[PDB]
Design a protein around this ligand. Sequence first.
Ligand SMILES: [Br-]
Ligand SMILES: [Br-]
Ligand SMILES: [Br-]
Ligand SMILES: [Br-]
Ligand SMILES: [Br-]
Ligand SMILES: [Br-]
Ligand SMILES: [Br-]
Lengths: 262, 264
Amino acid sequence: MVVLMTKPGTSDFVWNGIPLSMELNLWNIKEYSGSVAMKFDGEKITFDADIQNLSPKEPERYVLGYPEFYYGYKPWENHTAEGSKLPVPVSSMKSFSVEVSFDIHHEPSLPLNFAMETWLTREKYQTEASIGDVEIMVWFYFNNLTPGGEKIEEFTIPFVLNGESVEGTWELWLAEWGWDYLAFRLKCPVKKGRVKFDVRHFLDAAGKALSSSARVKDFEDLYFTVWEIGTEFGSPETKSAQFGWKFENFSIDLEVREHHHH
Amino acid sequence: MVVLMTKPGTSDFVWNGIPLSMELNLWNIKEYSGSVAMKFDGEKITFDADIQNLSPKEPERYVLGYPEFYYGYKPWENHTAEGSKLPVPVSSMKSFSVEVSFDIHHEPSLPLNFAMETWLTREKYQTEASIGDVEIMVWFYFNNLTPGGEKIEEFTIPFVLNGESVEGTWELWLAEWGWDYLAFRLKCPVKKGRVKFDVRHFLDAAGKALSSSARVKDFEDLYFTVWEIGTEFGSPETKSAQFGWKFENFSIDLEVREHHHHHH
Ligand SMILES: [Br-]
Ligand SMILES: [Br-]
Ligand SMILES: [Br-]
Ligand SMILES: [Br-]
Ligand SMILES: [Br-]
Ligand SMILES: [Br-]
Ligand SMILES: [Br-]
């Protein structure tokens, strides 16, 4: 299964029996010159960009794009690969373990992160996120890039790094924009390696942080729609972007609480 | 050569052609029960503690002990293993690279660090440290423990981590006690791995930080007496300690400055 993209768009693929979507996502790019290439070869997914003459569509949104791949339904795209077990309500999720090997390369000054995210929505199949909805980001890497909003808390969350169980300190950045923006940023970023973690830990911390919010009142009743894996890049000042990534050894294990458990 | 200790004290040993001293150091423990064991087997050095009924000698000093090994002369113990190249004046040191593989294990609540250190003295073989002398610690790991004094600066200092060159951010903690206490703490602690770094880089940052000191007058003229490698542990509320460590693949490389003979 060789799936290749050289311009913005979305393609579905199957990796280790998991149905997924790849998105060469340049959402906030107005214009550009150069090259972009996304490829899935059956064993791995890679992305490379060597783009110039950049301008943002909306300078206030800061980042330029998010080349990624995802499991589940992405609301902003009205899209899901066939056979995905997502969306599921947050209350029915016992655990959601994600495993991936990664390598991030970039031109040194480039604002960039290695971020994973979900959209928590009131309705199962929304086409946007608004007041009452949540965007939860998990940053494993960052370079000359700070999350949006303000740092409100710090959480200790375990994960497996290169087969070793480690306790990470995750900064929580909150913003009350069109929707609720929550970004958990690892204090000690990792550019390459293999990580294994349970998304449930980030859902617990986010529910606890939103426990006094007048906007997100029924946290556990929201639908966990997707799990996106990619790199946000750029700033309103970025005119040239040279970077890429490689993802390998990918696996997801979703545990849903049902009547036969216990 | 097998070196084994099961109570506080010192023993000399030779590792990969390097003369060293091991110290089962419980310096601030007034009393204890349970087991302590330090061992060198030719290839590695290990320590294990399963101690209870702990009480400090001086509660104000906070930590309970520092089981360690060292290269050179430790002033407080008036001791050196035969054949060490230290003490040397700081000005003479071009480079002092240290390499070690380490694994620290401990009960989760235990106050503990993986800290390396030197004592910078005015005279070559002092028996203690006082005003004008410096204590410089390098913390690669910490658990439920903060260095003494206050955070006065942050420094970018490179090191090799698991064969990859990295640039650590180190907090500098400074305290004006009986001597000057300086502690460089890695913002991103590592309890297991392989590290290679140059002590000269920490001395350069310690020299800058102490540039306008009324106590420390001439940094480069002081003697670099020792390089201690161990784990500080405990607190005045610590009643029992369960932890251990293992150190392997140890090497040091001292590069001294060359002299040019003047005829006057
Ligand atoms: Br295409
Ligand atoms: Br690059
Ligand atoms: Br961390
Ligand atoms: Br997991
Ligand atoms: Br233990
Ligand atoms: Br660091
Ligand atoms: Br180095």
